[PDB]
Design a protein around this ligand. Sequence first.
Ligand SMILES: COCn1cc(C[NH2+]CC[C@H]2O[C@@H](n3cnc4c(N)ncnc43)[C@H](O)[C@@H]2O)c(N)nc1=O
Ligand SMILES: COCn1cc(C[NH2+]CC[C@H]2O[C@@H](n3cnc4c(N)ncnc43)[C@H](O)[C@@H]2O)c(N)nc1=O
Ligand SMILES: COCn1cc(C[NH2+]CC[C@H]2O[C@@H](n3cnc4c(N)ncnc43)[C@H](O)[C@@H]2O)c(N)nc1=O
Ligand SMILES: COCn1cc(C[NH2+]CC[C@H]2O[C@@H](n3cnc4c(N)ncnc43)[C@H](O)[C@@H]2O)c(N)nc1=O
Lengths: 343, 343, 342, 343
Amino acid sequence: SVFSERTEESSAVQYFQFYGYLSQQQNMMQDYVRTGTYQRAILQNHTDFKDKIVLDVGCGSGILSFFAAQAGARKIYAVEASTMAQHAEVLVKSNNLTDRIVVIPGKVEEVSLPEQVDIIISEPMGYMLFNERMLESYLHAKKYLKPSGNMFPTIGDVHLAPFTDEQLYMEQFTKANFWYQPSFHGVDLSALRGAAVDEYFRQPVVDTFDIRILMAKSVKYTVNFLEAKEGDLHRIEIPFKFHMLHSGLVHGLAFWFDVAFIGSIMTVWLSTAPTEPLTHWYQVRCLFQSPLFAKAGDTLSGTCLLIANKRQSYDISIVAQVDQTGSKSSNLLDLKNPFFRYT
Amino acid sequence: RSVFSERTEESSAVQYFQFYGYLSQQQNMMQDYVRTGTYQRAILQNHTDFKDKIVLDVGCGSGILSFFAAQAGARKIYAVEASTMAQHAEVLVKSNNLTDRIVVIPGKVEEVSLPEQVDIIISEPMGYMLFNERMLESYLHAKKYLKPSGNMFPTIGDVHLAPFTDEQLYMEQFTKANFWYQPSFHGVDLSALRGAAVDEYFRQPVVDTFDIRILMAKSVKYTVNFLEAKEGDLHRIEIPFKFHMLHSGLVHGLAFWFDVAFIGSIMTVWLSTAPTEPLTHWYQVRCLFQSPLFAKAGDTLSGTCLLIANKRQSYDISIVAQVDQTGSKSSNLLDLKNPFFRY
Amino acid sequence: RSVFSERTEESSAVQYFQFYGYLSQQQNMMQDYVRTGTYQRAILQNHTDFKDKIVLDVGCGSGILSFFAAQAGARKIYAVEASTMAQHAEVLVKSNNLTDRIVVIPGKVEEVSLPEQVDIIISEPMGYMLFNERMLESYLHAKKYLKPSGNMFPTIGDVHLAPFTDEQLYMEQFTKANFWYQPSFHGVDLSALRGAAVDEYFRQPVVDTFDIRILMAKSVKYTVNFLEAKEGDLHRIEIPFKFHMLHSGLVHGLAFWFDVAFIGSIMTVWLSTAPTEPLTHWYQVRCLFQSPLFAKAGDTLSGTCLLIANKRQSYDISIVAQVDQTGSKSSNLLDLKNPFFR
Amino acid sequence: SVFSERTEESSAVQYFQFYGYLSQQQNMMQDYVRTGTYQRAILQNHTDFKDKIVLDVGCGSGILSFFAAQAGARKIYAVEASTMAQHAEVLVKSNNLTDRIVVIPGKVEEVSLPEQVDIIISEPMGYMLFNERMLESYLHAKKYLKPSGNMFPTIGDVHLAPFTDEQLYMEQFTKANFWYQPSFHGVDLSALRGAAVDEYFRQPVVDTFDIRILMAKSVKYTVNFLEAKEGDLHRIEIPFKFHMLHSGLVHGLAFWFDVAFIGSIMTVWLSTAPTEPLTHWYQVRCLFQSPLFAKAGDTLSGTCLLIANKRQSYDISIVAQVDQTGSKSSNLLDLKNPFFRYT
Ligand SMILES: COCn1cc(C[NH2+]CC[C@H]2O[C@@H](n3cnc4c(N)ncnc43)[C@H](O)[C@@H]2O)c(N)nc1=O
Ligand SMILES: COCn1cc(C[NH2+]CC[C@H]2O[C@@H](n3cnc4c(N)ncnc43)[C@H](O)[C@@H]2O)c(N)nc1=O
Ligand SMILES: COCn1cc(C[NH2+]CC[C@H]2O[C@@H](n3cnc4c(N)ncnc43)[C@H](O)[C@@H]2O)c(N)nc1=O
Ligand SMILES: COCn1cc(C[NH2+]CC[C@H]2O[C@@H](n3cnc4c(N)ncnc43)[C@H](O)[C@@H]2O)c(N)nc1=O
């Protein structure tokens, strides 16, 4: 199957074991902006669901399918690969919707659907949008979509912006300098200091921050789910050229994302920006190995390259330079194992 | 066929050794001064057990215990580690000018080949509730390389269990499960999953610390002698208990902690994780009853704690407890692999 | 045969009037200075509404309100009381030398005979959640003796309901019901009765007081005009509500309290049992949801509170409420006859 | 029916409405001494239940019948007049004992039983034992008992003792003096002071106390349930002659009770004495209208006459005199409406 060939067994096992916990479902269900916005997006666009055939990709407990039912859907095929699929089956029955919702346990790449659908609903977003590589499953599911179909969400916007956070930057060396001592219980640990530093900077930082740390207007990269193919997400190149609004040291790039549900009646947005109420996605920051100095009016240019790996994630390569001075910095990060810093 | 792989699911082992490949993880355990200091004390104060001896370090990580053995005057130390950390151990050996005495051997101890038999095996195989991670079996497996008169550091392990009362913790866990009682979460009836939820939450052992005044009886001790035990002895561990209740009230579950002893030629050194001792990264472990049992002082609380090893490098825990004077019985099942870190 | 007996089970009435025959009970309400003081204030500052007038005191008890009417210059007061306390009131009338102005008439106001029509009716018919005990119907029934332009003290009653958050109270009641979850109480499996246990406990309205900070929205008010209302109006009371949520969080239920107003010729006097005011023996009443509803600020909480009068001199309470923006719905049933005094 | 003939309907309505609440059942079940002692008496006398026919009078939720089943009874007829009977039926079903326990809704005086039983079990005790008049139902049930049959409990002892409590006595007047003021909001309430005093002294006081207020060894009155007829409890004359242990003012009499389960293997006692842990029966105190002075060595004599009324309770008439001085005092009380003073 498409899924198995692009995914290490070991990763998938852990992955779907994670999503088999009800506390996990509960965690996201209790994120009100997420759940409420989805419900709002579906119900306020009822003409996109009334008497329609629906596919729910990765339905979990099946909540989104129930929203599709509330909107008047004729038939909803709810696909889920984790064991949560049982619990969804329980809920459909207990809610007297066995006639409209069909839970189909398995990976969307492997199961079979009896008919084509009018619309696909899903929540494939991970950290920095792309983490978990579910965007690909969502796009893969379009093999079941009628030429007349819609996708909820319809587009996804990733935003990148340079930031200054002197403390976050110095934090890494404060932690790594543990190894910079010539006699830890009689052992000289110093030789590992460099490797320790390396390890810390490879982790993207998951948390939130004050918007005043942002030093330039964000650059946006858009995925149109109606148009994009799976292969388009194996290699994602985000070129950028930031026009610096403030003077100071740029310590790295901040990431967040929005999705839009473009329905027949209205467009509804779900935003994870630092200007909006906090979600379980938070924001993601990737540090530069060396900060770059820039003055207001200077230009910070370069590329963010995301290469997909078989651990259901991406290798992040970021290169940036201040055009006016020629000061250059790089970093390589492993998105699969971020550092949860939020307190 | 390797012993390790035969008892271990691939997916679990990958994750397992990925976790221990991070330097931050090493730092975290190294910074536990009680642990590190006590190990160094046990080794250095029993230096005659190491002088001009052959040593095996099982799961050496960064290699600190091997360095303690080197400080103690060991003639040759074979330091085995299956994670990538082994590369970092090699660096320290070189930078500390101990290349002639410490030899890092990458791989699983069940799979590597050792050049000679050793005089003593040192290790830190203890996990949560002592038995989590199933490394005790690797530690015991390694005895195939031990001379007939050889020693084990640690030499024995004592598991302690005692009933406790903690209304807050219980209500804390029940409150989480009460989410699934809702008959109309965004219009969806979740109640049918309420039973499954409470099951899931009470399935998690609670890792943290507590005040000793919550203990309602003298602890019961279960001892594993590492010099004598076989791997097979740890596939099914049955711990019978009979507590004489010192206080009246609700027993909400059983608390677990452990001690290990380094029985050397000069002296015996103890490492304790009891709640009467300073806190370690092992903390203490509590298994909640789904239903608390009322008992008065002078009553007897009897039953068994049964540990069945699984292929995820952990144990399925079954606890049965009864108030003998009334016949009030409680039964519970816990998954030790996935505890709730409450601290 | 009488209106009272037809709407009341004998057993309930017996127990009911047995309760009000104790002097300690009388003392208990008289010692509520806010209550008694406000009544005297309402009557005395509106002395012109009593000056040389004919008065009916419905359920006079010890006869205190009648004495206030006497102090205000009333010509003649008919004091009706169905319990045995009526004997004690007559003693006080005699010992206070007011035999010429206060006439005690033993019996139910639905059954006794009055010699003449009155200019004003005084009473204290309020119970828990205002309506408990169903005496308002007796109070309204008594208007058959009121001259056309006559007055009522109190003149109106306002019931207030507001959503609240109180997790501790909720888990307090939830902790109690889980007793019945035990699969081995002395070796006995009680779990099969859990559902019934939760039902029983959450059916009880909670009588006590609380900090006003637990209220999540401005209260909604339901008004009874005693000058206009009929008995029948209180057999089935439907109270619609739409709360505009001021805070985000869990709504654990609805809190109820009431005010009455004495609208006299000189001034209007209010008696309040709100949580912003000093505590009275009416306290406040809260009806819990079996499961709380989450709402964030700006949302709207809508639904209905339905009160059905029963033959035990009380009400069957039905509360249905929903968060409009999300469709989170709750339905609940409470038995006002069986409150929980915490 | 016998029950209807001795009971006013309104009282019966109130009475069985009280016992229809699960919270009420729960409250007695949560009395560990009560429930545990019943269980102990039944289980340690298992030979009195093994393969026997049992009658459970007023079974409530059915707890004692389940105990009888645990002891090995062949058949248990469980009679209950309140609606709780339905709940008992539920538990019988869920505990898979439908073949051994038969719930019979109704009053034991009115229902039909198919056969004679070997033993009757019940908990008919009220305040000072006799309140609620259920002992008569218990004795009435012996029409279904085989000769040589047994009763659990087998006997009941009511204990009386003189007490001194100056505060309790003066309390009545502190409360009644509310009415002794010439201008309560302009009203002279004084004329009702006497009636208020009368009212307070008619109520027996339910609460507990320090045993040090007791001025003599109690006098005991025994009901042997094996020998007694119900009619024996319509008029209960309890003569008393106390040998005063302490000097002082006697303000009244204190009441409590014990029951004994005299089985073939052993006798088990349930005590509500003030020297034992507190139960939901507490203790009962009846005040003299005027205190009597007594010296150590004096004798306090008289009678406590209990006259049963149709409100399922008793009018208590107490007369007492100090023999050596001839100082005499009496009181008449209404046991149906006691004053709960306990804090
Ligand atoms: C915010 O951090 C990440 N994150 C993301 C989300 C949103 N992603 C739900 C995916 C849900 O979809 C399921 N899923 C993923 N790949 C799937 C596939 N090929 N076939 C079928 N179901 C699949 C998966 O089991 C889970 O139930 C969330 N609900 N919680 C989170 O913690
Ligand atoms: C729950 O906390 C307990 N805990 C315990 C310890 C002590 N446990 C060392 C295992 C170390 O031993 C290694 N290891 C495990 N099984 C092994 C095996 N067959 N062969 C070789 N090395 C092995 C593994 O890679 C790790 O480096 C720790 N260093 N951190 C902790 O967090
Ligand atoms: C605090 O909440 C309960 N509560 C209420 C009140 C206020 N309710 C006075 C009724 C008083 O009026 C009497 N009463 C009730 N229905 C009556 C009727 N058809 N005809 C004549 N008298 C009646 C009844 O006997 C009592 O004396 C209070 N005085 N104490 C309380 O404890
Ligand atoms: C603390 O003192 C009061 N008290 C006493 C007791 C002990 N008395 C049980 C009576 C139980 O027996 C029942 N009962 C009484 N007369 C009955 C009758 N002719 N026929 C059948 N059942 C009858 C009654 O419905 C209740 O289930 C208790 N279980 N709770 C209390 O609160």
